[PDB]
Amino acid sequence: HLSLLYHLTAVSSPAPGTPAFWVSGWLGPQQYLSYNSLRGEAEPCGAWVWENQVSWYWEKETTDLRIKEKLFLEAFKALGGKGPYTLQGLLGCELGPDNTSVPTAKFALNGEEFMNFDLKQGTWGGDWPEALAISQRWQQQDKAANKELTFLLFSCPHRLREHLERGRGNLEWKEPPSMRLKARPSSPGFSVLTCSAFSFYPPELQLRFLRNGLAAGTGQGDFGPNSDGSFHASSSLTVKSGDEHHYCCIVQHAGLAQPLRVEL
Amino acid sequence: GGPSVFLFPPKPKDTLYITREPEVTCVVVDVSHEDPEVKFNWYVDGVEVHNAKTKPREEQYNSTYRVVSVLTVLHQDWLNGKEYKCKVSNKALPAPIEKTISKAKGQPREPQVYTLPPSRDELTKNQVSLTCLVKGFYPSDIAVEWESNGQPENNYKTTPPVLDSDGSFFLYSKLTVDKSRWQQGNVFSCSVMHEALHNHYTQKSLSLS
Amino acid sequence: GGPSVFLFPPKPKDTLYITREPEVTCVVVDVSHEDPEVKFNWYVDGVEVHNAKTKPREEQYNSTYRVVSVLTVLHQDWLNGKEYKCKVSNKALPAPIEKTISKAKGQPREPQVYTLPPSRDELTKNQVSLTCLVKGFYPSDIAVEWESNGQPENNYKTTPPVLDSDGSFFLYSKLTVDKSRWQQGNVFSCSVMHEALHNHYTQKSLSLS
Amino acid sequence: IQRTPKIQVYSRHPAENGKSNFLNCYVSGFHPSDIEVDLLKNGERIEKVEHSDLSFSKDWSFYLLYYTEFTPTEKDEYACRVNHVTLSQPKIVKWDRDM
């Protein structure tokens, strides 16, 4: 079910010492790769430094991303006008049933999707004027179209397979959460219950509230990452003061054989 | 009685061009000097939002405060007929005045642009009138420009639309240039921008022939 | 507070054509159901006159009486910038509301009419767009029609004016006809009527060429 | 096309006074990418704040993890301070112990 996805970003006038362009590469919700226009080199992130990886893998990455850098910084020439720009791209692929890849290639300008890459016609598309401009600049190039094709239909899925084999260790990692449930006097005759999940991987996880064994739904959920690739979650609920000890909190998660009841 | 409210749409060019900002505005005049504070709200297809940006008090000669609230809507949004709203509440108003604006909804129609050169008769004189008829389009909102030799043109005017019998609208644009220029052959290109335009944009051309 | 008043001009066609009646109208709404009677007056370049003709009460759904007074001005008059006036007095109004209308005065300019045939591109399809540009005219007021084969045409629309940089206005008119008709050669003639037109009228022609 | 940040502050491990931990601040859902995020100990900024790579989500909005090692004490008060184009003035979020 997992997927290789690159998060390309360029800006037209960067705060100085900031990079004009940069990429983050992801395997599922793990960041494996990292690149930017200053350093100019694709580097492994996190536990992926220790991946049993082959020679030339990384400089293949670098080579590809440099073509991307050029393309992206080229886009702002095509747009012409003054006002600062932010060009984003989401590129990748996901494995499908029959030893089959499914590609993704969308882009956004100043925070709105506007352009895409049609893998059938081998053309960029989108119909905003901005997208027509950029689409045109790229389509008339040293076979930029072909390289995007190879990158998505060949390189991407070949990489994805390679990482699955050589990086099971990371991908299949499992860490169940530490749980805490607490009561916080809030209002007049009210109080806030907060269930919290600490340090878990993978990030799929649900929090639920019971009140004497019957569902009180969920309230506001919150979800986030820790420094170490693990995750954090919390859910909160309004509740009659003095009626607190009646509630508990239940948690579902891949790293637990069965759902956990969490007392106050 | 109390103050009144006026709710303006975004700029048609700004609703196609991302690079530009499509501002859905909320202007309230005839406001009480005594009770100046006003509580704006906003509702996207019913759902409230908190990305409003209120400009400060811009008082007039007529002792009435004038206040303005700008919402930066999305591009894609507006064009999907998402229904917006300005809920103004003031102590100078007993109840709240609500004003609901949108895209002029309905099946939009591809415009159809043709150029027309200056007529026989006209050419005699030093000046000419390069016509741009644009017909067969829905809706009203539409941007029209001129440009020559890769470079925009100033000397022109463009009539607003009128409703064509068929239900769609149409428009004209009278770019004037000097005779010499037109004779020299220089290619002129009437540019149009509109919702149903393929790529939200098309331009046509006009030259000696 | 009380009722308000609106003062409309005559019809541009009616200000050139004698045969027609140029009616300078005085329409008052928001009138008190309690105090319905209203005392009109009229003043030609200051001088009062007694040839007014008041229509009776034409009440609306909104419980406000609507009253109307018609003055039949002269032809020659209006066009000499004679300044007219409706003085409405009602007990529902403390003071009298006075509204003064006239010809859009200033040095009037001869219009200049050219036809333009349907463009290359357009002809492909079954329908065509016989353009009539009319530019270089003052003032706004102006009548435009079509006529073919000695006989008027229905299928057309005409944009209102817009103010041309030079100060004069201009206009367009998009008479649509079928292709066959135009091909058969039948002569079409865009007709214009305006104050500064020689003989208050001119018409031009358009045909296969 | 212009979005306001969402600020979460939470510890990595359950908070226990005198035991070592990490404090995270997770700024998210903002646009454009320029953002100043400072972690505050008792109102003044910490200098050993590390932070993750600037990235973006399925919905194109940017996000970022700032984090510091720390050993909480009962007395100490922490907070996260964010400036961004869309903010009148720095927004400060207090680290609720419970969440």
Ligand SMILES: *[C@@H]1O[C@H](CO[C@H]2O[C@@H](C)[C@@H](O)[C@@H](O)[C@@H]2O)[C@@H](O[C@@H]2O[C@H](CO)[C@@H](O[C@@H]3O[C@H](CO[C@H]4O[C@H](CO)[C@@H](O)[C@H](O)[C@@H]4O[C@@H]4O[C@H](CO)[C@@H](O)[C@H](O)[C@H]4NC(C)=O)[C@@H](O)[C@H](O[C@H]4O[C@H](CO)[C@@H](O)[C@H](O)[C@@H]4O[C@@H]4O[C@H](CO)[C@@H](O)[C@H](O)[C@H]4NC(C)=O)[C@@H]3O)[C@H](O)[C@H]2NC(C)=O)[C@H](O)[C@H]1NC(C)=O
């Ligand atoms: C004190 O003075 C103020 C003005 O200051 C002036 O100071 C004096 C001293 C002098 O120097 C003047 O020269 C100065 O101008 C007064 O403020 C004004 O008040 C009036 C009414 O009280 C408002 O009138 C409305 O106007 C809008 C159109 O406004 C645009 O165009 C104006 C000039 O052309 C301009 O002033 C406006 O700013 C505005 O421009 C737009 O600005 C926005 C925002 O930035 C831009 O995005 C736009 O691009 C820009 N557009 C253009 C074009 O430039 C008009 O739409 C309103 O019409 C409705 O209301 C009528 C009654 O008032 C009603 O009869 C009509 O039917 C119409 O109602 C609707 O009609 C349409 C039909 O399609 C439908 O939408 C609806 O169905 C229908 N409504 C229904 C059915 O219910 C209206 O006339 C004026 O806008 C306002 N000024 C500004 C600015 O907003 C102040 O009132 C005065 N105080 C007192 C106590 O007298």
Ligand SMILES: *[C@@H]1O[C@H](CO[C@H]2O[C@@H](C)[C@@H](O)[C@@H](O)[C@@H]2O)[C@@H](O[C@@H]2O[C@H](CO)[C@@H](O[C@@H]3O[C@H](CO[C@H]4O[C@H](CO)[C@@H](O)[C@H](O)[C@@H]4O[C@@H]4O[C@H](CO)[C@@H](O)[C@H](O)[C@H]4NC(C)=O)[C@@H](O)[C@H](O[C@H]4O[C@H](CO)[C@@H](O)[C@H](O)[C@@H]4O[C@@H]4O[C@H](CO)[C@@H](O)[C@H](O)[C@H]4NC(C)=O)[C@@H]3O)[C@H](O)[C@H]2NC(C)=O)[C@H](O)[C@H]1NC(C)=O
């Ligand atoms: C009860 O309802 C009445 C209407 O009935 C309706 O019933 C309801 C139930 C529903 O069924 C509706 O569908 C029905 O229509 C209300 O009566 C109306 O009230 C309003 C305001 O109260 C009047 O608004 C004015 O309108 C004129 C334009 O009116 C023409 O066009 C209208 C439709 O397009 C039409 O209704 C009119 O009849 C009229 O048509 C003309 O008729 C004459 C007479 O036979 C013909 O000769 C003409 O050929 C014909 N013309 C066309 C075209 O068809 C408009 O000009 C006014 O604008 C001024 O006032 C604005 C504020 O109201 C102001 O903001 C503007 O600036 C403008 O002021 C001037 O602007 C110009 C700029 O160039 C300059 O002249 C000035 O400088 C400037 N003034 C300055 C600076 O001071 C105005 O909007 C409406 O006319 C009226 N109906 C009729 C009829 O007259 C009734 O009010 C309501 N009661 C209550 C209590 O609510």
